[PDB]
Amino acid sequence: GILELAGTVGCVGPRTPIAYMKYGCFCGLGGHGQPRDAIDWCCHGHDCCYTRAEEAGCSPKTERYSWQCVNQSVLCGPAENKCQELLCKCDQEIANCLAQTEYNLKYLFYPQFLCEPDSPKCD
Ligand SMILES: [Ca+2]
């Protein structure tokens, strides 16, 4: 859920999870176009992961799962069901992806209407 997502990102990265609430073309609700930078690419991959999760009958925004932060690393506990395993994997992935990125203020609160119609395909 959003709680785990915020927590996992906060656990590994150098900045507040809120820094990615509205950034570039993909960090934030929905998203399309050309990912503006490394951070935006992390969000694109995360959007893709969440979509796969949603198609599997999971609820990315609220489905709770067990995890732990040890030495700034996300540990996904033994998953009970597939959805818990998938979501933790998704959040763990974006948290790791964002950890070594540089933040570009020009993309903070970037106007979504400037984002192109075509987006990169999901893996
Ligand atoms: Ca998004």
Side-chain angles (χ1 to χ4, degrees):
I2 186 61
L3 188 65
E4 290 84 358
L5 175 52
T8 53
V9 171
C11 166
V12 191
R15 60 187 71 91
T16 177
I18 301 305
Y20 315 99
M21 261 180 55
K22 186 54 179 179
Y23 181 107
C25 290
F26 298 82
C27 303
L29 295 190
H32 59 270
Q34 163 70 251
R36 294 297 189 267
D37 65 358
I39 288 174
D40 211 15
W41 261 110
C42 291
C43 293
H44 169 278
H46 190 252
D47 282 6
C48 287
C49 199
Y50 266 19
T51 293
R52 299 291 85 69
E54 283 186 292
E55 303 175 318
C58 310
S59 303
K61 297 177 181 179
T62 55
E63 189 155 20
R64 302 295 296 287
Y65 62 74
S66 184
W67 72 285
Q68 184 175 184
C69 182
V70 181
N71 193 200
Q72 300 175 73
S73 70
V74 172
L75 298 191
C76 291
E80 312 183 307
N81 58 54
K82 198 65 181 183
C83 281
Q84 280 170 45
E85 175 191 355
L86 300 170
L87 295 178
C88 193
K89 190 288 178 184
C90 293
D91 298 342
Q92 176 181 236
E93 173 177 61
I94 196 180
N96 290 330
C97 185
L98 297 167
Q100 299 298 174
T101 62
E102 296 314 309
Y103 201 83
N104 196 332
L105 284 52
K106 72 170 65 178
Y107 297 127
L108 171 60
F109 296 131
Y110 191 70
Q112 183 125 302
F113 56 71
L114 291 180
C115 300
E116 304 76 5
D118 310 299
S119 309
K121 294 182 180 177
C122 288
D123 295 353

